[PDB]
Amino acid sequence: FKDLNLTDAQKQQIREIMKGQRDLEERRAMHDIIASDTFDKVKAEAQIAKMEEQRKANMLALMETQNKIYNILTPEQKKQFNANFEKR
Amino acid sequence: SFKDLNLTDAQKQQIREIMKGQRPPLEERRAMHDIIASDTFDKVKAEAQIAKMEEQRKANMLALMETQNKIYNILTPEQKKQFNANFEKR
Ligand SMILES: [Cl-]
Ligand SMILES: [Cl-]
Ligand SMILES: [Zn+2]
Ligand SMILES: [Zn+2]
Ligand SMILES: [Zn+2]
Ligand SMILES: [Zn+2]
Ligand SMILES: [Zn+2]
Ligand SMILES: [Zn+2]
Ligand SMILES: [Zn+2]
Ligand SMILES: [Zn+2]
Ligand SMILES: [Zn+2]
Ligand SMILES: [Zn+2]
Ligand SMILES: [Zn+2]
């Protein structure tokens, strides 16, 4: 989703980008927490803390990728990127 | 799937109860927007931003997990089996 009228050079600069940072026993542990007879808060706090590490890595990847995408855009395309960002 | 499990009247009430007993952060998004729309990627400020709502995320996730555990446990074994099998597929 990118209604920015992007140039051929741009699309392929973008592929280059979504390849460095285009580069699950988590959901198993949460499954075990939900499906247990009893709710173990301390065990759930530790799962949340471990999820924080992957969220960190994922958010850093997303944001770095998006920052590089932004900084190949024209002033006009940047304004449009920013407006689009306010709505999704 | 996920939410269509042939809940009985009683289960419908019991879920109603649970969900009162455990009930969009724009300021967070604004700060993501400042990091993305800058002429450089500032990792140290990005890490600060990401970490900022840790405690609120903890409370919300703990509430969510306790709520889901409580609803799992009012299910019959056939419904638990359905829910678990769907869970593996997500
Ligand atoms: Cl799982
Ligand atoms: Cl924003
Ligand atoms: Zn599972
Ligand atoms: Zn324990
Ligand atoms: Zn990098
Ligand atoms: Zn009825
Ligand atoms: Zn506010
Ligand atoms: Zn914004
Ligand atoms: Zn700002
Ligand atoms: Zn500068
Ligand atoms: Zn912390
Ligand atoms: Zn804490
Ligand atoms: Zn409680």
Author numbering:
A (entry chain B): 29 to 51, 58 to 122
B (entry chain A): 28 to 50, 56 to 122
According to the publication:
Spy is one of a group of chaperones that allow clients to fold while remaining continuously bound to the surface of the chaperone. We have previously observed that the chaperone substrate Im7 exists in a heterogeneous, largely disordered crystallographic ensemble while bound to the chaperone Spy. These peptides each had a single iodophenylalanine substitution at position 18, 19 or 20.
The Im7 peptides L18pI-Phe and K20pI-Phe crystallized in complex with Spy show a very different pattern compared with the multiple signals observed for L19pI-Phe. The 5.2 keV phased anomalous difference Fourier maps of L18pI-Phe and L20pI-Phe each show only one distinct anomalous signal attributable to iodine. In both cases the peak heights in the phased anomalous difference Fourier maps were very strong: the iodine signals were detected at 26.4σ and 32.5σ for L18pI-Phe and K20pI-Phe, respectively. For K20pI-Phe, a second data set was collected below the iodine edge at 4.5 keV. Consistent with the L19pI-Phe data collections, the strength of the iodine anomalous signal detected is highly dependent on the crystal quality. The larger peak heights for L18pI-Phe and K20pI-Phe, compared with each of the L19pI-Phe peaks, suggest a higher level of occupancy at these positions. In the case of K20pI-Phe, a simultaneous fitting of the new L19pI-Phe and K20pI-Phe signals within 0.43 Å on average was possible. However, cross-validation tests in which the K20pI-Phe signal was held out did not back-predict the K20pI-Phe anomalous signal.
